[PDB]
Amino acid sequence: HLLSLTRRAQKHRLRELKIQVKEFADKEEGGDVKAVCLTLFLLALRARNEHRQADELEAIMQGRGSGLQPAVCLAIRVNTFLSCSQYHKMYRTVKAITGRQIFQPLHALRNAEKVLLPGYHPFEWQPPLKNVSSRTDVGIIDGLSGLASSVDEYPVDTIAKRFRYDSALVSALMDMEEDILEGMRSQDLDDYLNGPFTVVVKESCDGMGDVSEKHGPAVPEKAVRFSFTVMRITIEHGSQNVKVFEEPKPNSELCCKPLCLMLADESDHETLTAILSPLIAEREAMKSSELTLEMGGIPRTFKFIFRGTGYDEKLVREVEGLEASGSVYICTLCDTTRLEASQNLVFHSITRSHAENLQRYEVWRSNPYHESVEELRDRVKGVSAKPFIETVPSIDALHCDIGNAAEFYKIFQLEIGEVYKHPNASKEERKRWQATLDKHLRKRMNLKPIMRMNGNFARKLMTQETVDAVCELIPSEERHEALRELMDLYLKMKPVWRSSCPAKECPESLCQYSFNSQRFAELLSTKFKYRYEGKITNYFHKTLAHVPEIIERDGSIGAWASEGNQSGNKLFRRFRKMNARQSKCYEMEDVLKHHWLYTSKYLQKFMNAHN
């Protein structure tokens, strides 16, 4: 074979073709034997389907250098959870074996971290924020905010770290600079324009359940994560507000920028308020000022709108002074009781507010009309503690479906048992009704039975097909008509709470939602009297009573869902194991800085480069 033999030999075996090629080059290509042989070999390589070696030859002939910028190295390190030691091994190995420095060393990545972390860029607030420092070089700060720790004081059992809220807002904005400029471009606006931008910031807070690592005698360790999500940025260009940025995946863990991480129980009110109050204070202060910050060389100004929607009901109730979820006062939007909400199905309005709730706590505290505890509690509608966070409670598209399906399932079981006709039934009769329904759904609808309510059972059960199925088990067909119309009203309502923008996607559904929920409740009250027990769920109450008001308040439902942060805990634990110094004070800030970096849109752009 040619490649077995030596250069003198291969030259011997190829001399004839070499002479022919020199002739071809001089007669057609001006004597470039080098270029002609290169092209011949590249095209031969492409012919044998070996594109890899051909492209590598192309890159080495072009001399185009392969060097990853330290920011890309950081992107990979962060997004694959490599520790410093592991990254260093990979770096030194690739550099030693290819001779080229494809990955950058660790100090370069640290320096690139500095840009993407709070405390790097300068900024100004006009007018300066009330009770907030004007220093711009603040990074990670102790989450206790100088909380007293002497042995005399209350015992401090938690470790927490946080960013300064304005500083974190600056870091997040600078991170999305490229998307802001590209969004202005895509809206036919100018890169250099600086007119006032408005930032709609979604605020969130949740407990992360258990965080313990354990070798049994598991001592639990709970955590609280205080976060914010830039939802949209608009620019005033006229009497018009042009949407230059809108978060594509608003419930993702990718854009949920961690602001404060603490090892404490969300039910531990003393510590919750001690850690969170300084954040709330900076947030308040920013509500009354404009941020000037240099982007692409042009100073810009930003006005903020904080909307605390990332709070599940338990945390809403805790921070807004309300009673625990088992209370008679079931809604965090109005003053209805469970009985009231069960009898009055559709006509309620969003009457609670942070101010009213502050007021009601003061009424509770001072007892100004010298009332008994039952009368006082009635007066203040269950606001028996002082609220300390203004929230905007909502509902997720999931729970609307869930509540409706629970009700329809119970209706199916009772309509199989003809309770419209027989008031009483033993436990055995109802159990056989449910067995009949579950068997028939498994047979005709391929629906597994479930012992516990859940989302996709609801999704698959709330179909007209299932109504035909269950009607195959009902004697009277007037009740067939009733069930078909009830499910028709359900299907006329569902698009409003599921769509991403109901104002645009299903304007007739949104316009007729209130009329349809009225007819829904009227059908339940006339042709379904039996299913009234004075009981109802917050999910059903909110679905029938507050969906149109919540849409008009927020524009949508499905996007302010409670769905994503179930990944957070996992994320947290990972960072604590593989990327954190093993010391209580440092591990927290290492988790914080790694979580910050994991959320930066810059590095995520590098990690989606192929598209």
Least Å from the CB of residue 312 to DNA? 6
Nearest to Mn ion of 206, 390 (CB atom) = 206
Q: What are phi and psi of 408, to 5 degrees?
A: -65, -35
Rounded Cα gap, residues 201 and 224, in angstroms? 19
State the pairing for strand pair 298-310/197-210: parallel
DSSP sequence for 158-178: --EEEE-HHHHHHHHHHHTHH
Q: Please report the sign of the dihedral spanned by the C-alpha atoms of residue 32, residue 37, residue 38, residue 43.
A: positive
Of 90-129, binders to its own copies (CB under 8 A) are: 90, 92-102
Nearest to its own copies of 214, 442 (CB atom) = 214
Of 546-575, binders to DNA (CB under 7 A) are: 562, 566-570, 574
562 binds, among Zn ion, its own copies, DNA, none (CB under 5 to 8 A by kind): DNA
For residue 405, give both structure tokens. 């399906």
Cβ burial of 411 (10 Å; 0-12, 13-18, 19+) is buried
For residue 480, give both structure tokens. 């067939």
348 binds, among its own copies, Mn ion, Zn ion, none (CB under 5 to 8 A by kind): Zn ion
Kindly state whether residue 584 participates in binding DNA, applying the rule CB under 7 A: yes
DSSP sequence for 259-308: EEEE-S-TT-HHHHHHHHHHHHHHHHHHTTSEEEEEETTEEEEEEEEEEE
Of 434-463, binders to its own copies (CB under 8 A) are: none
Rounded Cα gap, residues 486 and 489, in angstroms? 5
Per CB under 5 A, the list member of 77, 348, 399, 494 interacting with Zn ion is 348
Task: Judge whether 108 and 70 are in contact, CB under 8 Å.
Answer: yes
Among the residue ranges 14-22, 144-152, 294-302, 319-327, the one whose residues contact its own copies (CB under 8 A): 14-22
Quick note: the x/- pattern for DNA over 392-411, rule CB under 7 A, is --------------x-----
Of 446-485, binders to DNA (CB under 7 A) are: 448, 450-457
Rounded Cα gap, residues 31 and 28, in angstroms? 8
Task: Judge whether 101 and 69 are in contact, CB under 8 Å.
Answer: no
Kindly state whether residue 333 participates in binding Zn ion, applying the rule CB under 5 A: yes
Least Å from the CB of residue 585 to DNA? 6
Size of the site for DNA (CB under 7 A): 67
135 binds, among Mn ion, Zn ion, DNA, none (CB under 5 to 8 A by kind): none
Of 17-56, binders to DNA (CB under 7 A) are: 43, 46-47, 49, 51-52
Task: Judge whether 233 and 244 are in contact, CB under 8 Å.
Answer: yes
Task: Judge whether 587 and 576 are in contact, CB under 8 Å.
Answer: yes
Of 178-217, binders to DNA (CB under 7 A) are: 208-210, 213-214
Of 302-331, binders to Mn ion (CB under 5 A) are: 312
Kindly state whether residue 210 participates in binding Mn ion, applying the rule CB under 5 A: no
Least Å from the CB of residue 87 to its own copies? 8
Nearest to DNA of 79, 194 (CB atom) = 79
| Residues of this chain that bind Zn ion (CB under 5 A) | 331, 333-334, 348
The footprint of Mn ion (CB under 5 A) covers 206-207, 312
